[PDB]
A paper describes a structure:
Chloride Intracellular Channel (CLIC) family members uniquely transition between soluble and membrane-associated conformations. Here, we expose the function of CLIC5 as a fusogen. We demonstrate that purified CLIC5 directly interacts with the membrane and induces fusion, as reflected by increased liposomal diameter and lipid and content mixing between liposomes. Moreover, we show that this activity is facilitated by acidic pH, a known trigger for CLICs’ transition to a membrane-associated conformation, and that increased exposure of the hydrophobic inter-domain interface is crucial for this process.
To elucidate the role of inter-domain interface exposure in CLIC-mediated membrane fusion, we first determined the crystal structure of the F34D mutant. Of note, to facilitate the crystallization of F34D, a small flexible loop (residues 57-68) was removed (CLIC5–Δloop). Similar to other CLIC proteins, CLIC5-Δloop-F34D consists of tightly packed TRX and α domains, connected by a flexible linker. Despite the marked functional effect conferred by the F34D mutation, the static high-resolution structure of the compact conformation reveals no significant differences between WT and F34D. Close inspection of the CLIC5-F34D crystal structure reveals two positively charged residues, which can potentially form a salt-bridge with D34. R37 is within a salt-bridge distance (3.7 Å), while K191 is not captured interacting with D34 in the static structure. In addition, the per-residue root mean square fluctuation (RMSF) values (representing its spatial fluctuation relative to its average position along the simulation) are similar at both pH values. These simulations reveal that a salt-bridge interaction forms between D34 and K191 over a substantial fraction of the simulation trajectories. Notably, while CLIC5-WT and F34D share a similar HDX profile at pH 7.5, the WT protein exhibits a much higher exchange at pH 5.5, indicating that the F34D mutation decreases the conformational heterogeneity of CLIC5 in solution. Importantly, as expected, this mutant prevented the large CLIC5-mediated change in liposome diameter measured using DLS, as well as lipid- and liposome content mixing. Together, these data indicate that F34 is critical for the function of CLIC5 as a fusogen.
Author numbering: 25 to 251
The structure:
Amino acid sequence: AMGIELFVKAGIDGESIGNCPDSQRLFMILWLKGVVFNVTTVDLGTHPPFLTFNGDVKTDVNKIEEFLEETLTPEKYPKLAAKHRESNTAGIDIFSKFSAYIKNTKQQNNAALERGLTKALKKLDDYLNTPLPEEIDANTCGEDKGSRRKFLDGDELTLADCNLLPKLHVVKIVAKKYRNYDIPAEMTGLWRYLKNAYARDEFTNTCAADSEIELAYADVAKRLSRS
């Protein structure tokens, strides 16, 4: 861990964190590992974020994630992988559903696309509200016999969170700005998940500005013009 330089996307200001979920993903991982590293916002354009370890460039985001978990190990660094297989697949279809929802221009399809995103969101809400086996044994579940854990896998942030949280945040900001869509408040688990993230510095200080995210989708998202 002698040399760790992280190159994330830069915002319109040229210095701030720009909208790039993959960037926030790796940023959060390094932060949660407690390792010494440097961040440099650069104009990556369409190029993905990357990092250099001891001068050697690392590429991909999934491959970079595997390297960091395999290199920064106990006892000096905490293992950040999720213990439950289900935690790594919750909400995987959300971003895809959201993108098709906000990229649509025909009003005749809006309703269906919206239900698509909502259903994807409810599945994620369901997992977060269903107590994990540990909580059931521990009797760590609420009076509603409902899960009250803070994140996907448990009460500690994991690689699954570093991957999902940035996309989920983007979905919330953009879908609201360009469709006036709100993640229903009845999805108590999902909202409790999001609020917990906003309380942790590792997500807050690695997060792009609401205006930055919105401006980023100004061309991507389309207005429901055609019937």
